[PDB]
Amino acid sequence: MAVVTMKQLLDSGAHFGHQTRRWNPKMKRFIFTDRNGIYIIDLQQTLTYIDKAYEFVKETVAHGGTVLFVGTKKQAQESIAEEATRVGMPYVNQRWLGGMLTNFSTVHKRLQRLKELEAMEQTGGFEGRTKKEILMLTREKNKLERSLGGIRDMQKVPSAVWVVDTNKEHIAVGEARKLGIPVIAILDTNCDPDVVDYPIPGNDDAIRSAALLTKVIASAVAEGLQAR
RNA sequence: GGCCUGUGUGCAGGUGGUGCAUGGCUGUCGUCAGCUCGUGUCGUGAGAUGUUGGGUUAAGUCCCGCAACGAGCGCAACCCUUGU
């Protein structure tokens, strides 16, 4: 079962991959052909694996669970932010700090610092805070927001992750597979299916495709919530 | 009770030794800006990362990046004096 299909999928350009000289030949299971020097992806496999991952995220969220959206790539980051802001789920789209989920104690302590600074802002304490103090702490708040702002309310150690461009975000994949978390991911030709559990073999270098895949995963988690 | 008196007894006393047994204090590299730690990660491991890289700074000062995130001692500032 899929909310979308080949037509409204390849309207974007998800069927594309990368050139024939940058690819993991584990992808052969998902290769369709080679055209214009790039490989083309088996969208039937993408549909059945979309169904797999949809059922996965649905049952996890219904049992009580959370997905971390990670799309630091420029091609996807704004869409990732949009869907994650809509559904109200944790996300990062600017940078992955090494240790977000495996040094989560420390990263959560710095989230507590962010909330302390936001309570400071609520108090509007500006007169006891000198000028360089105000400016350096605003810069620090902006750093903490750019990095962790998408997960202000996390305190989870979550149950799933949603990756764009494993090659770009190999740190999150390693942290997940080290801590025992499942990762759904957009598998392009340059990616590795051995690390991804419930993949989604689309394009990562295409903004429309990444937005579309984030949208269907967003809808899946929304229905997993509505099933509560 | 104090005070001495001696019998002495304990013992005081030693600027007598060892600063290669020691504290304390000090010098010194150097007021140089560096030295470290927790967690995480990499590595069989010693260890590495952080703390490297680009730029900037008097400065590990700060920024941008970055499997690192942070913290601490140091930097700077708080102090005195001089200058309106």
Curated annotation (Swiss-Prot):
GO terms for cellular component: cytosolic small ribosomal subunit. One of its GO terms (molecular function) is structural constituent of ribosome. Belongs to the universal ribosomal protein uS2 family. This is Small ribosomal subunit protein uS2. Keywords: Ribonucleoprotein, Ribosomal protein. It comes from Mycolicibacterium smegmatis (strain ATCC 700084 / mc(2)155). The keyword Methyltransferase does not apply. The gene is rpsB. One of its GO terms (biological process) is translation. Signal peptide: none annotated.
